[PDB]
Scaffold this active site. Structure first.
Site, PDB file in Angstrom:
ATOM      1  N   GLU A 100      16.217  27.201 -15.326  1.00 26.16           N
ATOM      2  CA  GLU A 100      14.968  27.138 -16.098  1.00 26.16           C
ATOM      3  C   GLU A 100      14.968  28.102 -17.329  1.00 26.16           C
ATOM      4  O   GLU A 100      14.219  27.912 -18.286  1.00 26.16           O
ATOM      5  CB  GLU A 100      13.824  27.518 -15.175  1.00 26.16           C
ATOM      6  CG  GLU A 100      13.613  26.616 -13.910  1.00 26.16           C
ATOM      7  CD  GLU A 100      14.828  26.458 -13.003  1.00 26.16           C
ATOM      8  OE1 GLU A 100      15.334  27.446 -12.426  1.00 26.16           O
ATOM      9  OE2 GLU A 100      15.294  25.317 -12.848  1.00 26.16           O
ATOM     10  N   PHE A 176      20.541  20.956  -3.933  1.00 24.97           N
ATOM     11  CA  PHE A 176      21.248  21.035  -5.203  1.00 24.97           C
ATOM     12  C   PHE A 176      22.265  22.163  -5.231  1.00 24.97           C
ATOM     13  O   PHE A 176      23.379  21.991  -5.706  1.00 24.97           O
ATOM     14  CB  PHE A 176      20.294  21.051  -6.394  1.00 24.97           C
ATOM     15  CG  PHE A 176      19.903  19.658  -6.855  1.00 24.97           C
ATOM     16  CD1 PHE A 176      19.426  18.699  -5.932  1.00 24.97           C
ATOM     17  CD2 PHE A 176      20.027  19.278  -8.220  1.00 24.97           C
ATOM     18  CE1 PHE A 176      19.063  17.381  -6.362  1.00 24.97           C
ATOM     19  CE2 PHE A 176      19.675  17.958  -8.672  1.00 24.97           C
ATOM     20  CZ  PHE A 176      19.195  17.013  -7.758  1.00 24.97           C
ATOM     21  N   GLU A 181      26.142  23.369  -7.080  1.00 23.85           N
ATOM     22  CA  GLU A 181      26.346  24.743  -7.569  1.00 23.85           C
ATOM     23  C   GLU A 181      27.474  25.420  -6.876  1.00 23.85           C
ATOM     24  O   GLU A 181      28.543  25.611  -7.473  1.00 23.85           O
ATOM     25  CB  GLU A 181      25.070  25.547  -7.522  1.00 23.85           C
ATOM     26  CG  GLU A 181      24.248  25.207  -8.710  1.00 23.85           C
ATOM     27  CD  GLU A 181      22.723  25.195  -8.502  1.00 23.85           C
ATOM     28  OE1 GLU A 181      22.219  25.407  -7.372  1.00 23.85           O
ATOM     29  OE2 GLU A 181      22.032  24.975  -9.526  1.00 23.85           O
TER      30      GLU A 181
HETATM   31  N1  LIG Z   1      14.434  23.360 -12.681  1.00 22.59           N
HETATM   32  C1  LIG Z   1      14.692  22.190 -12.095  1.00 22.59           C
HETATM   33  O1  LIG Z   1      14.003  21.036 -12.548  1.00 22.59           O
HETATM   34  C2  LIG Z   1      15.684  22.091 -10.939  1.00 22.59           C
HETATM   35  C3  LIG Z   1      15.159  21.528  -9.773  1.00 22.59           C
HETATM   36  C4  LIG Z   1      15.811  21.711  -8.555  1.00 22.59           C
HETATM   37  C5  LIG Z   1      16.996  22.445  -8.536  1.00 22.59           C
HETATM   38  N2  LIG Z   1      17.567  23.016  -9.657  1.00 22.59           N
HETATM   39  C6  LIG Z   1      18.845  23.809  -9.477  1.00 22.59           C
HETATM   40  O2  LIG Z   1      19.377  23.763  -8.140  1.00 22.59           O
HETATM   41  C7  LIG Z   1      18.819  24.779  -7.325  1.00 22.59           C
HETATM   42  C8  LIG Z   1      17.427  24.469  -6.727  1.00 22.59           C
HETATM   43  O3  LIG Z   1      17.335  23.206  -6.105  1.00 22.59           O
HETATM   44  P1  LIG Z   1      17.773  23.002  -4.566  1.00 22.59           P
HETATM   45  O4  LIG Z   1      17.781  21.566  -4.202  1.00 22.59           O
HETATM   46  O5  LIG Z   1      18.966  23.850  -4.310  1.00 22.59           O
HETATM   47  O6  LIG Z   1      16.543  23.581  -3.746  1.00 22.59           O
HETATM   48  P2  LIG Z   1      15.118  22.868  -3.643  1.00 22.59           P
HETATM   49  O7  LIG Z   1      15.174  21.921  -2.522  1.00 22.59           O
HETATM   50  O8  LIG Z   1      14.101  23.895  -3.395  1.00 22.59           O
HETATM   51  O9  LIG Z   1      14.725  22.221  -5.053  1.00 22.59           O
HETATM   52  C9  LIG Z   1      13.438  21.642  -5.064  1.00 22.59           C
HETATM   53  C10 LIG Z   1      12.494  22.454  -5.932  1.00 22.59           C
HETATM   54  O10 LIG Z   1      12.768  22.103  -7.282  1.00 22.59           O
HETATM   55  C11 LIG Z   1      11.717  21.311  -7.803  1.00 22.59           C
HETATM   56  N3  LIG Z   1      11.889  19.915  -7.291  1.00 22.59           N
HETATM   57  C12 LIG Z   1      11.054  19.240  -6.405  1.00 22.59           C
HETATM   58  N4  LIG Z   1      11.556  18.005  -6.154  1.00 22.59           N
HETATM   59  C13 LIG Z   1      12.717  17.860  -6.859  1.00 22.59           C
HETATM   60  C14 LIG Z   1      13.636  16.798  -6.967  1.00 22.59           C
HETATM   61  N5  LIG Z   1      13.675  15.883  -5.992  1.00 22.59           N
HETATM   62  N6  LIG Z   1      14.754  16.942  -7.792  1.00 22.59           N
HETATM   63  C15 LIG Z   1      14.973  18.124  -8.489  1.00 22.59           C
HETATM   64  N7  LIG Z   1      14.059  19.167  -8.367  1.00 22.59           N
HETATM   65  C16 LIG Z   1      12.946  19.054  -7.573  1.00 22.59           C
HETATM   66  C17 LIG Z   1      10.508  21.961  -7.152  1.00 22.59           C
HETATM   67  O11 LIG Z   1      10.208  23.215  -7.763  1.00 22.59           O
HETATM   68  C18 LIG Z   1      11.028  22.069  -5.720  1.00 22.59           C
HETATM   69  O12 LIG Z   1      10.271  22.952  -4.919  1.00 22.59           O
HETATM   70  C19 LIG Z   1      18.625  25.940  -8.267  1.00 22.59           C
HETATM   71  O13 LIG Z   1      19.607  26.929  -7.999  1.00 22.59           O
HETATM   72  C20 LIG Z   1      18.650  25.311  -9.666  1.00 22.59           C
HETATM   73  O14 LIG Z   1      19.730  25.825 -10.387  1.00 22.59           O
HETATM   74  C21 LIG Z   1      16.901  22.836 -10.862  1.00 22.59           C
END
Ligand SMILES: NC(=O)c1ccc[n+]([C@@H]2O[C@H](COP(=O)([O-])OP(=O)(O)OC[C@H]3O[C@@H](n4cnc5c(N)ncnc54)[C@H](O)[C@@H]3O)[C@@H](O)[C@H]2O)c1
Ligand SMILES: N=c1c2ncn3c2ncn1[C@@H]1O[C@H](COP(=O)(O)OP(=O)(O)OC[C@H]2O[C@@H]3[C@H](O)[C@@H]2O)[C@@H](O)[C@H]1O
EC number: 3.2.2.-
Lengths: 253, 253
Positions: A100, A176, A181
Site C-alpha cells: 500500500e 497472498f 510473497e
Molecule cells: N493492498 C491490497 O489491495 C492487497 C490485498 C491483500 C493482500 N496484499 C498483499 O498480500 C498480503 C496480504 O494479503 P493476504 O492474503 O496475505 O492476507 P489477507 O487474507 O488478510 O488479505 C485480505 C485483506 O486484504 C484486503 N482484501 C479483502 N479481500 C481481498 C481479496 N479477496 N483480494 C485481495 N485483497 C483483499 C482486506 O484489507 C482484507 O482484510 C500483504 O503482505 C500484501 O503485500 C495486498
C-alpha cells in the site's frame, strides 16, 4: 451488493499518481522513471477491450515493470489478516514499507475496475463477483503486485500475523503471502521476522513455535533464511491498547 | 532566509482534488458542489500575479467559501504544537476530524507556493521563509482555512495542546487556534474539551486549572461554552508509549 466500479478511473489513477510523484514518500521511497501517462497506457492495456475474466498473471507484467521501485533494505513488511494493525504500526512508511506504500499499491488501493470488449473497453457500470472468474484472472493484479514487491525485498523482512483467528491460521499457503510473497523472496533476503498479533481480551489460538507458525518456520529455514518470531512486542501492544484502553493486558503499573 | 516551492502545483492540486473527491472520506465527509477546475480558480486568483507578500485575511475567502464542507457534530478537533500526536489520535477521520482531513486541508497540506507578478504569476524557484512576510500575509491561507473550519463546527469540539513546552504556553492568543479558530466558534458549539499532552520522560509545563489553560478555561466560559480538560488520557498515552515503550510512564503491571 452488485460490484460498483470506480467512476473516472483514469482521472483518479492519474491524480494519485501525480500526487505521489511530487509529494509522497520522497525520502522513504525512490521515484519511478516512467511518467504518469505511460503508466496509464500500461495499466489500461492490461484489461481493456478484453472480457472481465479474460486476464492472467502475466497481464499487468509491463505495468508492474514500469512501476517497481527499489525497496529499502530491512524495512519491508508483509501482513496477513491484520490490515489496520499492520498499517498503524508500519506507520506510513516511517517504520516499515507495505505494498500500500508503493506507487502501484498507493495508486490502485480500494479501486474497482474491469474490462469489456465494446468501446470504451472498460465497464463503468458493473463488475462481476471475483468468485466467478478463474483464479488467475481475479488474482492477476494484486497477485502480480505482491510477487513483484516480494521479489524486490532485501535484508530482513517483517511479517505480521493474526494469532487469534480460530477460523484462519496465522500462516497459510493459500493466503497472498503464502501464494505470492514468501516463495518469491530472493537470496537478497536474510531473515524473516514474524510478529504475531494476540488480540486484546480474546483467546490465543496460534502460539509461536507451534502449528502453522512452526510450519512457516520450517519453510523459512528451507529457503536458507534466518527466522525469528515475537508475540505482542511492547511497541505494538500499545497501539492495541489505545483502542481498547480498559483492557486487561493494558493494566498500567 | 528562503524556501523551495512545490513543483507542478496545479497538477498536484487537481490530482489531489479528484482523489479526494472520488475516493477519500466518503462515509465521513460530504463532497463539494464545485468542479475541481473552479476550486483551482478561486484559489489561484488569491495569490497570482502579486508580490509574494501581497496577501491578507480575505484573499482566499471565495476559495474557502467554495471548498467548505459541513462538518459532523462533535467530531471536530483543533491542535497546537502537537501535530503528529493529534493526527495519530484522530485517526484519519475515524475518531476525530482535523483540518487536514478536509478538502481544503487535504489539498494544500505541506504544499509551498507564492505569487510573483511576472509571467506565470507564481515563483517556481524560490520563496520567502517564515518571518520574512508580514503576519497577515503569512497567515492568509491557513488562518482563513482555520477560520471556516471553525465557523462550521457544531456540538462538542476538541482541542489538543502541548503541555511540555517551556518555550510556548499550551494556549496562546496569537496561535492559529487563538487568533482564528476560537473567535469564530458559533453558538451551535456547546463544549470545548482540552487534551493536554505531556511528552514522555519530559517535565510537565502546564496543567489543567492553571496558567494558559486557566486563561483558556475562562475565555471558553465567557463565550458561554461548557469546559473540560484532561492530561494524558489513557487512549492518548498508549500512542506515545508505542514510540518510547521503555519509558517510566508506561511500565505495565
Ligand atoms: N493492498 C491490497 O489491495 C492487497 C490485498 C491483500 C493482500 N496484499 C498483499 O498480500 C498480503 C496480504 O494479503 P493476504 O492474503 O496475505 O492476507 P489477507 O487474507 O488478510 O488479505 C485480505 C485483506 O486484504 C484486503 N482484501 C479483502 N479481500 C481481498 C481479496 N479477496 N483480494 C485481495 N485483497 C483483499 C482486506 O484489507 C482484507 O482484510 C500483504 O503482505 C500484501 O503485500 C495486498
Ligand atoms: N492548519 C494549520 C497549519 N498548517 C501548518 N501550520 C499550521 N498551524 C495551524 N493550523 C490550524 O490552526 C490550528 C493550529 O494552529 P496553531 O496553534 O498556531 O498551530 P501551531 O502548533 O502553533 O503551529 C505549528 C506550525 O505548523 C504551521 C504553523 O504555521 C507553525 O509553523 C489547527 O487546529 C489547524 O486547524
Amino acid at each position: 451488493a452488485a460490484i460498483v466500479p470506480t467512476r473516472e478511473l483514469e482521472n483518479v489513477f492519474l491524480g494519485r499518481c501525480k500526487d505521489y510523484e511530487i509529494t509522497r514518500y520522497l525520502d522513504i521511497l525512490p521515484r519511478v522513471r516512467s511518467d504518469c501517462s505511460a503508466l496509464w497506457k500500461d495499466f489500461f492495456k492490461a484489461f481493456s477491450f478484453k472480457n472481465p475474466c479474460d486476464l492472467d498473471l502475466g497481464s499487468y507484467k509491463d505495468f508492474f515493470t514500469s512501476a517497481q521501485q527499489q525497496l529499502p533494505k530491512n524495512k519491508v513488511m508483509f501482513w496477513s489478516g491484520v490490515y489496520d494493525e499492520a498499517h498503524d504500526y508500519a506507520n506510513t512508511g516511517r517504520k516499515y514499507i507495505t505494498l500500500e506504500d508503493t506507487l502501484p499499491g498507493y495508486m490502485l488501493n480500494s479501486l474497482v475496475w474491469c474490462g469489456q470488449r465494446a468501446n470504451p473497453g472498460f465497464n463503468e457500470k458493473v463488475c462481476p463477483d471475483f468468485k466467478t472468474c478463474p483464479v488467475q484472472a481475479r488474482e492477476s493484479f494484486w497477485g502480480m503486485a505482491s510477487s513483484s514487491y516480494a521479489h524486490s525485498a532485501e535484508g530482513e523482512v517483517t511479517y505480521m500475523v493474526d494469532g487469534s483467528n480460530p477460523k484462519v491460521p496465522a500462516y497459510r499457503p493459500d493466503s497472498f503471502f503464502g501464494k505470492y510473497e514468501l516463495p518469491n523472496l530472493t537470496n537478497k533476503v536474510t531473515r524473516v521476522k514474524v510478529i504475531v498479533l494476540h488480540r486484546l481480551g480474546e483467546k490465543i489460538i496460534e502460539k509461536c513455535g507451534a502449528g502453522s507458525l512452526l510450519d512457516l518456520e520450517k519453510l523459512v529455514k528451507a529457503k536458507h533464511f534466518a527466522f525469528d518470531c515475537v508475540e505482542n512486542p511492547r511497541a505494538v501492544l500499545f497501539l492495541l491498547c489505545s483502542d481498547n484502553p480498559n483492557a486487561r493486558e493494558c493494566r498500567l503499573a
